[PDB]
């Protein structure tokens, strides 16, 4: 069985031919105080020829604008160390630490989608005076812990049994791992801004950190090895799909300060020029 699905492309409006005019219709006179943006075209104000316009607004839809992988976390962890906590990496999930993806998402008040998550993992031989060995290929374990789950204490903790938590095992030299995640929030959409408190007496935690609560990620080596020290770096990439967004907002002007707040330093509106009339000369011998 085959089923045909028809795709409708949406191109932009043509311009219609227009001649001289002398009447009482005044398309150019408006009143911004109403809150209304004028819908005038060149054909209302000048004389125009007929043009058949074939351009399409395909690459400025929300799905094409947002469906691209972006880094959201980087971390390191060693094969051997004397700290017992530098042998695995762990973090709390969000998209607030790398500014590009954050600012892109923050043009909208509310968002809802599924995700495709990719990991990129690299390793390196630590600097030392004595180098040279023969190690087998290294293997890595990634475990996701929803809130309330038991937390690992070390790299040999029983919690790495992963009986109910989803995990990925991976070997160096293969293609980067990947998996997809559905829309998981107790609300009807994710919230990027929250002007409220965590406690009913209007105090406690302010803003974003009240609502997110989406678990943690832990990553370790599996070999339990390395006569000579080595270091690994893990990076996480997010790509949203099946997207919907609501309530557009003006884009961020000031530079970000931290991941918990919207705090900022006052910044100028733009950069200056010599004069309100200044425009540079470019047609000179």
């Amino acid at each position: 069985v085959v089923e045909a699905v028809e795709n409708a492309v949406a191109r932009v409006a043509d311009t219609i031919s227009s001649g001289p005019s002398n009447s009482q219709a005044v398309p150019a006179l408006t009143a911004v105080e109403t809150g209304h943006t004028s819908q005038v075209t060149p054909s209302d104000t000048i004389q125009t020829r007929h043009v058949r316009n074939y351009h399409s607004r395909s690459e400025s839809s929300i799905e094409n604008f947002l469906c691209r992988s972006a880094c959201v976390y980087m971390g390191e962890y060693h094969t051997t160390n004397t700290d017992t906590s530098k042998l695995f990496a762990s973090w709390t999930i969000n998209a607030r630490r790398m500014v590009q993806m954050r600012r892109k998402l923050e043009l909208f008040t509310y968002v809802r989608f599924d995700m495709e998550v990719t990991f990129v993992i690299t390793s390196k031989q630590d600097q030392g005076t004595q180098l040279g060995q023969d190690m087998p290929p290294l293997t890595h374990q990634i475990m996701y812990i929803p809130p309330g789950g038991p937390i690992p204490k070390s790299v040999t903790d029983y919690t790495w049994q992963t009986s109910t938590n989803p995990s990925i095992f991976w070997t160096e030299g293969n293609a980067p791992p990947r998996m997809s995640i559905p829309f998981i929030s107790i609300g009807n959409a994710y919230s990027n801004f929250y002007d409220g408190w965590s406690h009913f007496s209007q105090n406690g935690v302010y803003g974003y950190n009240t609502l997110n609560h989406m678990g943690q990620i832990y990553v370790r080596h599996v070999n339990g090895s390395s006569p000579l020290p080595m270091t690994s770096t893990v990076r996480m990439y997010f790509k949203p799909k099946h997207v919907k967004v609501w309530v557009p907002r003006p884009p961020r002007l000031c530079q970000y300060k931290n991941a918990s707040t919207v705090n900022f330093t006052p910044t100028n509106i733009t950069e200056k020029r010599q004069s309100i009339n200044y425009i540079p000369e470019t047609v000179k011998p």
Partner: protein
Amino acid sequence: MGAQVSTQKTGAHIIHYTNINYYKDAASNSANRQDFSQDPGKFTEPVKDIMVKSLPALN
């Protein structure tokens, strides 16, 4: 076999592709890149009384 055949993106002045779904969850499907709708009047014309644009705004 539950195949879908739809048209490819081309230009203006043999063009279709086929797809099969393999997984049991729809959150595993590929992105929806070929839907192009708009409703700009929601943000540009949010007024109660309609404004004709050939007539004066007030009076």
